[PDB]
Amino acid sequence: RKTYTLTDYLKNTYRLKLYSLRWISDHEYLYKQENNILVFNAEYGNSSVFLENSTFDEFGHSINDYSISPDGQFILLEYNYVKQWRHSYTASYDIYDLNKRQLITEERIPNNTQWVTWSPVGHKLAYVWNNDIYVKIEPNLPSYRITWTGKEDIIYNGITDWVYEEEVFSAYSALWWSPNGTFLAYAQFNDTEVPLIEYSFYSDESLQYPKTVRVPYPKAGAVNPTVKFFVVNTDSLSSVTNATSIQITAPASMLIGDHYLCDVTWATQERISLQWLRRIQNYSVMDICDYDESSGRWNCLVARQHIEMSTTGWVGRFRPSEPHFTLDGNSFYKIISNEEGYRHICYFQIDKKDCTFITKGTWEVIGIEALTSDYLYYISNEYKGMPGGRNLYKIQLIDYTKVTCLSCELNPERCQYYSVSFSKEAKYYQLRCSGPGLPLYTLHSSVNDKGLRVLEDNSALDKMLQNVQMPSKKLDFIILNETKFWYQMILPPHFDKSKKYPLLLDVYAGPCSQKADTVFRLNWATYLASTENIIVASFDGRGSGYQGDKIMHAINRRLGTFEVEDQIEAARQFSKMGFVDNKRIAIWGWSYGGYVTSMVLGSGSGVFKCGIAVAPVSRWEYYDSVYTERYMGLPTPEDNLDHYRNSTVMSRAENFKQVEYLLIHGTADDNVHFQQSAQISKALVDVGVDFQAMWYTDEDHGIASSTAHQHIYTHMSHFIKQCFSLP
Amino acid sequence: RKTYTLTDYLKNTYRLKLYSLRWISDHEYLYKQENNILVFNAEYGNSSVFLENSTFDEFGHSINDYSISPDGQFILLEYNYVKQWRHSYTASYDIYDLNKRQLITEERIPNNTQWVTWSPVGHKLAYVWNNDIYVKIEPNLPSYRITWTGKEDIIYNGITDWVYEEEVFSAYSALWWSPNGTFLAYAQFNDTEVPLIEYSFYSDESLQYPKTVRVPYPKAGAVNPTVKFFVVNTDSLSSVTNATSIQITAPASMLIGDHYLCDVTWATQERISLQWLRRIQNYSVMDICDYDESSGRWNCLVARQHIEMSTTGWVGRFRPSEPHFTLDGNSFYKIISNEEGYRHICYFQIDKKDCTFITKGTWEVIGIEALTSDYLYYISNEYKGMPGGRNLYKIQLIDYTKVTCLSCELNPERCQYYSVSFSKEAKYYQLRCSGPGLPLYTLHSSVNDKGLRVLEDNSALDKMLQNVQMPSKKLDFIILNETKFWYQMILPPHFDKSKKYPLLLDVYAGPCSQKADTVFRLNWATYLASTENIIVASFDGRGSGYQGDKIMHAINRRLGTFEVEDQIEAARQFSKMGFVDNKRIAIWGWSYGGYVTSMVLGSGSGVFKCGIAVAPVSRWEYYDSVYTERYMGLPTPEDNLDHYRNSTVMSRAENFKQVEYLLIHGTADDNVHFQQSAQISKALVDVGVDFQAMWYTDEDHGIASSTAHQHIYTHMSHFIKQCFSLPAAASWS
Ligand SMILES: *[C@@H]1O[C@H](CO)[C@@H](O[C@@H]2O[C@H](CO)[C@@H](O[C@H]3O[C@H](CO[C@H]4O[C@H](CO)[C@@H](O)[C@H](O)[C@@H]4O)[C@@H](O)[C@H](O[C@H]4O[C@H](CO)[C@@H](O)[C@H](O)[C@@H]4O)[C@@H]3O)[C@H](O)[C@H]2NC(C)=O)[C@H](O)[C@H]1NC(C)=O
Ligand SMILES: N#Cc1c(N2CCC[C@H](N)C2)n(Cc2ccccc2)c2c(=O)n(Cc3ccnc4ccccc34)cnc12
Ligand SMILES: N#Cc1c(N2CCC[C@H](N)C2)n(Cc2ccccc2)c2c(=O)n(Cc3ccnc4ccccc34)cnc12
Ligand SMILES: *[C@@H]1O[C@H](CO)[C@@H](O)[C@H](O)[C@H]1NC(C)=O
Ligand SMILES: *[C@@H]1O[C@H](CO)[C@@H](O)[C@H](O)[C@H]1NC(C)=O
Ligand SMILES: *[C@@H]1O[C@H](CO)[C@@H](O)[C@H](O)[C@H]1NC(C)=O
Ligand SMILES: *[C@@H]1O[C@H](CO)[C@@H](O)[C@H](O)[C@H]1NC(C)=O
Ligand SMILES: *[C@@H]1O[C@H](CO)[C@@H](O)[C@H](O)[C@H]1NC(C)=O
Ligand SMILES: *[C@@H]1O[C@H](CO)[C@@H](O)[C@H](O)[C@H]1NC(C)=O
Ligand SMILES: *[C@@H]1O[C@H](CO)[C@@H](O)[C@H](O)[C@H]1NC(C)=O
Ligand SMILES: *[C@@H]1O[C@H](CO)[C@@H](O)[C@H](O)[C@H]1NC(C)=O
Ligand SMILES: *[C@@H]1O[C@H](CO)[C@@H](O)[C@H](O)[C@H]1NC(C)=O
Ligand SMILES: *[C@@H]1O[C@H](CO)[C@@H](O)[C@H](O)[C@H]1NC(C)=O
Ligand SMILES: *[C@@H]1O[C@H](CO)[C@@H](O)[C@H](O)[C@H]1NC(C)=O
Ligand SMILES: *[C@@H]1O[C@H](CO)[C@@H](O)[C@H](O)[C@H]1NC(C)=O
């Protein structure tokens, strides 16, 4: 039979089908099919046409995406999409009135809009343009300008700056409408004193002089952006006077030094919760703020303030967890690390400081998915004690013993990794199984957790794959110091335990990482195992996630230590299996995985023949403040400078004489600056180590343009094949 | 015996000895021996200690260089040397008083000084600091500030900006003392509207944020720096008033558009000559300017202007040639292209337009070396009709048929490439033979051209090389369309014409290049031939120099055409030789050679298996104005934009699917910007062509730091060895 080839991976010959729906009520969803939008009844599965694929035939611009107002009266059409960072972009927008069949031609959303969002009910709009916020009460009416301080690279109103986008909110938006749309809350970031990262951008060959891109980016220990928080009442805006925004100040325990705003969650129409985190990220404070109708102000009583602190590490997996408030806003549920270091759901009353744990065990809650009047729905890795599996559960709010696993037993051999999408009030849910078998999308009723129908079963892909020699995936563990450490192996087709195969260790190994799981993927590793007969392994050692704080916090203040040592130990635990050729063990990774690959190659272990680091971190002082300091503290003599200096790739340069190394980096990487690889290469040159390199002109951290993506995987495939003597 | 290995090349195991002397008079020279400065009598060869080595250790810092004042009373000590571009650098300076035997610690030359020079007689000093000129009449006295307009990256007084340093003066200095030191002439450059090239500099790993280096650099067709010229009388400076600089303006034939100052040559104590060149570099004017006692100004008589133009190309090899004035300053000798396109010596009278050629023939004068009342001494490649040879000749000024070759027959098997250093009034001359045998330094007296003695014969190196399997060099020619084109081959030891060797074509091929010559070199090619048994060949095709304008101007307005085609043709001719393996032909080059290598690899010729381009030009609009426009004109639709767009490496990307390519570039290259290779790689990625790359962090055009130099040659050696199917060798660590 044929194999899954590199061209198959690069050209997406074998496509995974999805079933992306958008819930519009508690009983119906929208589903885009053949460019027309259908509305489905969840109970019976019948549909009607919501919006025909011919409606916008005469539009004149290619439509990137759409957003229907929650009341179904209008549609926002996004076009002229121009990417910025991981989440940010600018675009043009048109509004179409679905009842009148008219495009709005006056008081339009401006071109180069940075963010736009409908209110959660009705059809108000808030948007950010030139770093200032604007509100439109009706699509055909003029905008009210909320802020006047917006300034490129300095003041950001309602949008995040680079570090808050990448490391805190995972979004460009910094706008939060209240549940019924009365209030619009927003953050303001000030990057005045934040230093700029500067790099060249070459552009098309017609550009005679390269451009210098300058981005406010705080490296570890550098001056950070400051933040303020405001709430404006959108129902009391005037065309005559400027809008009044009410500031909600951070608590005094945060104002004493540098801090961050880390979560914004509306609890009710008149109550908002804010979480603040100290720059030393082991202390966080949640304020619960209530609107005072008599003064028009927002007050956060200390009686409703909650503290979260960590004595062994930082707070949260990547940040303090989100609270899930009951409808009345008087209580909330939140994931918290318990006394044994396992993250479980805690129930809080707003004015009581000790929470009650509602789940427990040597496993963790991954996320809270829905909170109804009677049940809380959550995803965990409890099932079979497998940290790399995910299943949906529900728990009765009045009786914590009444737990039901909703997905564990549906299709246990095919499906061990689920996510979920609930309807507006959770009467229905779509389950999305991503492995170990082919992804499966099903619809269920929460009335008694009964299956309704299969939405997408990937039968088309299954038929195409029957003709292909596909690899298999093994998920198991090794025991070190009486602790299980999980690994996965992508095994070549017709795998023979008596034979010896080359092995490639695919590594991430950053804090809270998980590379051993039950997910079905079609990627470069599939090609390496299917066509090249390489075993592609990954291992989750100390520092990895979802297994409790004794493992995750093992690398606290000590990156580049145990997680590096554990990848080497894993390869020792593998290299001695009679199926592993110990003369052909390689290692590769991107980003944090590039850092760990480089630290492993520089370890002098003698285990690895070769390795590839793509856009690696090389020294923690070069990476951003929020991520780096969470695990490393500050690079000062009083704090953790000694370990910052001891954990660099450059200090290990002499040991690279023992290995074949390929170092790759995009020149326009705004995230892990090209500087990091420029310092590695300089250190290798300074000690007389030969190595392979590749820069990618004008590519960023993703090296994701169509041509660059094909080129990097082609180059890396030649490198691994030469390392392993594969024809 | 052992071979000449890569480590031998990288560690300079086999060192060529030199004999660098400094003439101080018409009969004496200075020479550094065991860190001591000795003064030698040319006639007898006896020496005396001028300055003991120990003196250099009484400062507390290492001395980079020294300069003894012309009167021998002071020594200028250079330290804290910090390199800038090819020629420019800053340094600290101390002056030591040889008569008082003491360091001068008062009114010191400032730290970060950009340029310093003694007057040509006596001990005056002129220096440039913070882009302004200062003059010291006595080394321990306060300096007189000459200019007050200096401003970093904007106004340069007495020093060149980037493009004038690299492309016009081949120096950072823009100061010219008059012969007896009365006057100090200087240029002022104004870069206000010149765009900046910006690139990152990473520095030591402790630097948290990379630095952006910003240099005013005019790319082809961009706004150029403007220039002004001034002369100050240093004998009439006041401690009370500011100095009066007298401006000398360019002739109006230059002022009509963009132009350059291209030569400054003093003729007498009161006469200076200047050459100006239009931005379209086929028209130049020499002005002859006299000091006027009645006004205190400089008069450039219009009747004394000399125009030099080119109808087939640009003026001069790289710029108009320098004039050599007779003692009275009423006439001068200058190398000019004759009616047949050969560069020969012309004799001019200052007030007469037509010149008289004093030499002729199908060969060229390389340079005028000395001029006395009876003779003119010059270097040419006349001997044996070999354009890659060099010899010293003398011509009687009273009879041009009376030409004597001074070096041709001294040692014809060992010595075919000479340079010379004459004493102050040409009473003696040192001859420096650089090949084909080991370099040989000899001293001669001009009266009857008597050989006085051998100064350095490299006998120590000869003894070492007797135990090494050294390669040989063949210099010959191929005939193309009734024209001889020369080539050289570095041949492996025990060369067997019955065996098939791999061949690497080492290319420069830029306008006026010469890669086929009689010079003895110990370089990477020596290792490739000696140890790896690779033939390293070079070829001088169309556009190459020293063979007349018909060959040199063939590429006028057409870079990336005939010089590229000729390298492919040369390799075809070599590949047919039964001693070349046609399956193992590679090409490599740096700079213009990188551009040619890349154009050859993208040609689709099928001749070359692989190649390496180091810091290549990829598109002419990315390179500097002065060099680029000299050959290409302007990148405008009205001028030569079509050819600028047709001669890029990027347009040939699809053809690289047929070859193995290694692209290398330093990230801090201020000369051929990293941009050039960044656009090549992007074009190769865009067509799906695999290739090998290497960047060199913080290295410039030379990739010349000790560690980067070793690394680049090691990386290129592995690449060539793999291309040629040659074996590898393990090493302990
Ligand atoms: C998926 O299929 C569902 C099942 O058919 C669809 O639901 C149906 O929607 C229609 C339209 O909203 C409802 O229509 C009428 O309902 C009552 C009468 O209901 C009775 O008869 C129905 C059969 O005709 C039964 O289905 C009911 O159970 C019940 O016995 C009428 O009184 C209404 O009239 C009013 O509204 C119409 C406009 O809609 C006006 O024209 C009238 O003048 C009057 O004002 C509706 O005609 C129907 O009841 C409902 N059936 C259900 C829920 O069981 C569902 O819409 C579809 N979904 C999609 C996305 O396609
Ligand atoms: N999601 C996510 C990830 C993350 N971050 C989440 C929080 C925000 C932070 N800026 C980035 N990093 C960590 C990281 C640390 C420092 C610098 C950059 C990124 C990594 C990472 O590293 N890998 C690994 C990873 C990323 C991409 N491809 C890979 C291919 C093979 C092996 C590993 C791979 C995978 N995912 C992430
Ligand atoms: N001297 C000198 C050179 C020169 N210039 C003289 C005038 C001023 C100009 N800026 C630089 N270029 C030409 C050039 C053109 C464009 C960009 C940069 C340089 C070259 C060049 O190209 N090579 C070739 C050359 C240079 C160095 N090493 C080599 C190794 C192998 C093969 C060839 C090599 C050699 N010398 C020179
Ligand atoms: C957006 O840009 C287009 C193209 O220039 C222009 O026609 C249109 O009027 C702009 N829209 C707005 C809202 O300014
Ligand atoms: C931004 O912060 C700077 C100090 O870093 C301050 O001077 C400035 O007023 C602030 N701007 C706003 C709009 O808060
Ligand atoms: C609103 O504020 C802006 C910026 O301060 C100002 O220019 C404008 O005059 C204000 N408008 C009113 C009505 O006060
Ligand atoms: C929205 O909530 C606000 C705040 O309580 C309230 O004043 C308003 O009436 C609510 N709107 C609706 C439509 O219920
Ligand atoms: C937070 O971290 C700092 C730095 O490691 C430490 O000094 C402090 O005690 C920590 N707080 C807790 C509660 O552990
Ligand atoms: C196991 O314990 C030993 C002894 O304390 C320690 O050195 C090693 O790092 C541990 N390895 C793990 C936890 O993988
Ligand atoms: C060389 O010797 C002569 C005497 O013959 C003497 O006058 C002269 O000074 C000497 N020169 C040196 C530099 O020793
Ligand atoms: C040069 O720098 C050194 C070190 O800072 C200083 O001691 C010295 O005085 C400086 N010299 C002059 C001439 O300014
Ligand atoms: C430099 O040139 C600019 C025009 O480009 C002019 O404004 C300026 O005055 C000049 N400066 C000097 C000192 O000549
Ligand atoms: C010399 O020129 C400078 C700069 O224009 C000026 O500051 C200074 O006062 C002048 N000195 C005299 C003595 O005129
Ligand atoms: C130097 O030349 C100038 C200009 O002719 C003259 O005034 C001066 O006397 C000369 N110096 C000597 C030492 O002859
Ligand atoms: C100089 O070159 C330009 C462009 O080729 C040409 O138009 C002009 O005639 C040339 N001048 C001479 C003197 O040949």
Looking up tokens 């202390």 gives: A283
CA-nearest residue of chain A to B689?
Answer: A711
Query: Using the beta-carbon criterion (under 8 Å), do B205 and A619 form an inter-chain contact?
Result: yes
Pick from A648, A687, A707: CB nearest B685: A707
Q: Give domain limits for chain B.
A: 1-12+467-733, 16-458
Residue B362 C-alpha from the chain's centroid: 25
Q: How far apart are CA B502 and CA B532, in angstroms?
A: 9
Cβ of B148 closer than 6 Å to ligand 13, yes or no, is yes
Q: How far apart are CA B119 and CA B141, in angstroms?
A: 16
Query: Using the beta-carbon criterion (under 8 Å), do B682 and A692 form an inter-chain contact?
Result: no
For residue A115, the one-letter residue type is W
Query: Using the beta-carbon criterion (under 8 Å), do A210 and B222 form an inter-chain contact?
Result: no
- Which of residues 591 through 620 in chain B touch A, CB cutoff 8 A? 619
- Distance of CA A627 from the midpoint of ligand 2 (Å): 11
Pick from A221, A621, A697: CB nearest B678: A697
Angle in degrees, CA A404, A406, A412, rounded to 5 = 120
Instruction: Tell me, yes or no, if B692 comes closer than 8 A to chain A by beta carbon.
Output: yes
Yes or no: say if A211 and A200 are a contact pair by the CB < 8 Å rule: yes
Yes or no: say if B201 and B210 are a contact pair by the CB < 8 Å rule: yes
From the alpha carbon of B241, which atom of ligand 13 is closest?
A: 13
Looking up tokens 């980037």 gives: B162
- Which of residues 179 through 218 in chain B touch A, CB cutoff 8 A? 195-200, 202, 205, 208-210, 212
| A556: number of Cβ within 10 Å | 19
φ, ψ of residue B516 in degrees (nearest 5): -110, 110
Query: Using the beta-carbon criterion (under 8 Å), do B698 and A682 form an inter-chain contact?
Result: yes
DSSP state of A301: -
For CA atoms A31, A34, A36, A41, give the dihedral sign.
negative
Q: B496 to each of A430, B472, B501, how far by Cα in Å?
A: 79, 12, 9
Query: Using the beta-carbon criterion (under 8 Å), do B681 and A675 form an inter-chain contact?
Result: no
φ, ψ of residue B213 in degrees (nearest 5): -85, 135
Q: How far apart are CA A177 and CA A184, in angstroms?
A: 4
| Pocket test residue of A481, A547, A552, A573 for ligand 9, highest count of atoms within 8 A of CB | A481
Instruction: Decide if A1-12+467-727 and A16-458 have a common fold.
Output: no
The residues that bridge with A155 in the sheet, in sequence order, are A151, A190
Mutate to test the interface with B, among A6, A209, A211, A686 (most CBs of B within 10 A): A209
Instruction: Tell me, yes or no, if B562 comes closer than 8 A to chain A by beta carbon.
Output: no
Pick from B196, B682, B697: CB nearest A202: B682
- Which of residues 653 through 682 in chain B touch A, CB cutoff 8 A? 667, 673-675, 678-679, 681-682
Q: Whose CA is nearest to atom 13 of ligand 4?
A: A110
Question: Strand, helix or coil at A166?
Answer: helix
DSSP state of B374: S
Q: Which stretch of DSSP H or E encloses residue B645?
A: helix B641-646
Angle in degrees, CA A367, A373, A378, rounded to 5 = 15
From chain B, the residues in CB contact with A200 under 8 A are: 198-200, 674-675, 678
In b/e form, how buried is each residue of B659-679, taking b as 16+ CB within 10 angstroms? bbbbbbbbbbbbbbbbbbbbb
State the structure-solving technique. X-ray
φ, ψ of residue B623 in degrees (nearest 5): -90, 170
From the alpha carbon of A228, which atom of ligand 5 is closest?
A: 14
Q: How many CB pairs under 8 A join A and B?
A: 122
Cβ of A416 closer than 6 Å to ligand 7, yes or no, is no
| A305 CB-near residues (< 8 Å, 6+ apart) | A251, A285, A286, A287, A288
DSSP state of A167: I
Q: How far apart are CA B429 and CA B424, in angstroms?
A: 10
Yes or no: say if B43 and B29 are a contact pair by the CB < 8 Å rule: no
Q: How far apart are CA B569 and CA B580, in angstroms?
A: 14
| A668 CB-near residues (< 8 Å, 6+ apart) | A199, A201, A213, A674, A697, A698, A699, A700
Q: How far apart are CA A392 and CA A63, in angstroms?
A: 35
Interstrand relation of B324-325 and B306-309 (parallel, antiparallel or unpaired): unpaired
| Assigned token pair, A608 | 């690895």
Interstrand relation of A125-129 and A115-118 (parallel, antiparallel or unpaired): antiparallel
Yes or no: say if B366 and B546 are a contact pair by the CB < 8 Å rule: yes
Yes or no: say if A135 and A173 are a contact pair by the CB < 8 Å rule: no
- Is-cis flag, bond preceding A387, omega within 30? no
Q: How far apart are CA A262 and CA A275, in angstroms?
A: 5
Q: Name the closest ligand to CA A565.
A: 9
Angle in degrees, CA A351, A357, A360, rounded to 5 = 170
- What's the CA dihedral at B700, B703, B704, B707 to 10 degrees? 120
Q: Is A86 exposed, middle or buried (0-12, 13-18, 19+ CB in 10 A)?
A: middle
For residue A152, the one-letter residue type is E
| Assigned token pair, B418 | 């000479």
| Assigned token pair, A520 | 């079905």
- Which of residues 38 through 77 in chain A touch B, CB cutoff 8 A? none
Q: How far apart are CA A50 and CA A520, in angstroms?
A: 33
Mutate to test the interface with A, among B641, B651, B652, B685 (most CBs of A within 10 A): B685
The runs of H, that is alpha helices, within A496-582 are 524-530, 549-552, 562-575
Yes or no: say if A166 and A179 are a contact pair by the CB < 8 Å rule: no
Q: Which stretch of DSSP H or E encloses residue A371?
A: strand A365-371
Yes or no: say if A619 and A635 are a contact pair by the CB < 8 Å rule: no
Looking up tokens 């070769």 gives: A610
| Assigned token pair, A150 | 């917006």
Q: How far apart are CA B127 and CA B157, in angstroms?
A: 10
Q: How far apart are CA A562 and CA A480, in angstroms?
A: 13
Pick from B199, B694, B698: CB nearest A693: B694
Query: Using the beta-carbon criterion (under 8 Å), do B710 and A688 form an inter-chain contact?
Result: yes
| B334: number of Cβ within 10 Å | 22
Its CATH architecture, for the domain A1-12+467-727, is 3-Layer(aba) Sandwich (3.40)
From chain A, the residues in CB contact with B621 under 8 A are: 208
| B603 CB-near residues (< 8 Å, 6+ apart) | B564, B568, B652, B655
| Pocket test residue of B192, B229, B258 for ligand 12, highest count of atoms within 8 A of CB | B192
Task: Return the active site residues of A.
Answer: 591, 669, 701
Cβ of A617 closer than 6 Å to ligand 2, yes or no, is yes
Q: What does the H/E/C string look like for A73-128?
A: CEEEEEEEEEECCCCCEEEEEEEEECCCCEECCCCCCCCCECEEEECCCCCCEEEE
For residue A464, the one-letter residue type is M
Q: How far apart are CA A497 and CA B603, in angstroms?
A: 50
Question: Strand, helix or coil at A57?
Answer: coil
Q: Is A247 exposed, middle or buried (0-12, 13-18, 19+ CB in 10 A)?
A: exposed
Query: Using the beta-carbon criterion (under 8 Å), do A715 and B682 form an inter-chain contact?
Result: no
The residues that bridge with B478 in the sheet, in sequence order, are B485
Question: Strand, helix or coil at A530?
Answer: helix
- What's the CA dihedral at B487, B488, B494, B500 to 10 degrees? -40
Residue B295 C-alpha from the chain's centroid: 40
- Distance of CA A268 from the midpoint of ligand 5 (Å): 32
Cβ of A273 closer than 6 Å to ligand 7, yes or no, is no
Q: Is A726 exposed, middle or buried (0-12, 13-18, 19+ CB in 10 A)?
A: middle
Looking up tokens 């390389």 gives: B366
Q: How far apart are CA A631 and CA A720, in angstroms?
A: 32
For residue B417, the one-letter residue type is Y
Q: B611 to each of A75, B375, B656, how far by Cα in Å?
A: 57, 49, 10
Nearest to A650 by CA among B267, B444, B205, B452: B205
Cβ of B169 closer than 6 Å to ligand 3, yes or no, is no
Yes or no: say if B65 and B115 are a contact pair by the CB < 8 Å rule: no
Per DSSP, the residues of B580-638 read: EEEEEEEEEEETHHHHHHHHHHTTT-S--SEEEEES----GGGSBHHHHHHHH--SSTT
Looking up tokens 């000395």 gives: B370
Q: Is B252 exposed, middle or buried (0-12, 13-18, 19+ CB in 10 A)?
A: exposed
Interstrand relation of B306-309 and B283-292 (parallel, antiparallel or unpaired): antiparallel
Q: What does the H/E/C string look like for B548-582?
A: CHHHHHHHCCCCCCHHHHHHHHHHHHHHHCCCEEE
Q: B728 to each of A648, A719, A720, B693, B723, how far by Cα in Å?
A: 32, 18, 19, 21, 12
Q: A108 to each of A61, A127, A184, A236, how far by Cα in Å?
A: 16, 11, 20, 22
The residues that bridge with A516 in the sheet, in sequence order, are none
Mutate to test the interface with A, among B208, B628, B656, B714 (most CBs of A within 10 A): B208
Q: B202 to each of A173, B107, B208, B509, how far by Cα in Å?
A: 33, 37, 9, 33
φ, ψ of residue B558 in degrees (nearest 5): -140, 50
Q: How far apart are CA A442 and CA B462, in angstroms?
A: 86
Question: Strand, helix or coil at A573?
Answer: helix
Interstrand relation of A196-201 and A211-216 (parallel, antiparallel or unpaired): antiparallel
Looking up tokens 């004039």 gives: B323
Query: Using the beta-carbon criterion (under 8 Å), do A697 and B682 form an inter-chain contact?
Result: yes
Pick from A200, A209, A650: CB nearest B205: A650
Q: How far is A705 from chain B (nearest CA, A)?
A: 10
Yes or no: say if B156 and B175 are a contact pair by the CB < 8 Å rule: no
- Distance of CA B272 from the midpoint of ligand 14 (Å): 15
From chain A, the residues in CB contact with B650 under 8 A are: 205
- Is-cis flag, bond preceding A436, omega within 30? yes
Yes or no: say if B605 and B570 are a contact pair by the CB < 8 Å rule: no
Q: What does the H/E/C string look like for B334-359?
A: EEEECCCCCEEEEEEECCCCCCEECC
Pick from A200, A688, A694: CB nearest B711: A688
Pick from B208, B212, B714: CB nearest A219: B208
Mutate to test the interface with B, among A204, A205, A694, A706 (most CBs of B within 10 A): A205
CA-nearest residue of chain B to A635?
Answer: B208
Structural class in CATH, domain A16-458? mainly beta
Helix, strand, coil percentages in chain A from 3-state DSSP, rounded to 5: 20, 40, 45
Per DSSP, the residues of A629-661 read: HHHH--SSTTTTHHHHHHS-SGGGGGGGGGSEE
| Assigned token pair, B71 | 């009167």
What's chain A's Rg over C-alpha atoms?
26
Yes or no: say if A197 and A178 are a contact pair by the CB < 8 Å rule: no
Record the resolution, in angstroms. Answer: 1.6
Task: Return the active site residues of B.
Answer: 591, 669, 701
Q: How far is B193 from chain A (nearest CA, A)?
A: 14
Cβ of B166 closer than 6 Å to ligand 3, yes or no, is yes
Topology of the domain comprising B1-12+467-733: Rossmann fold (3.40.50)
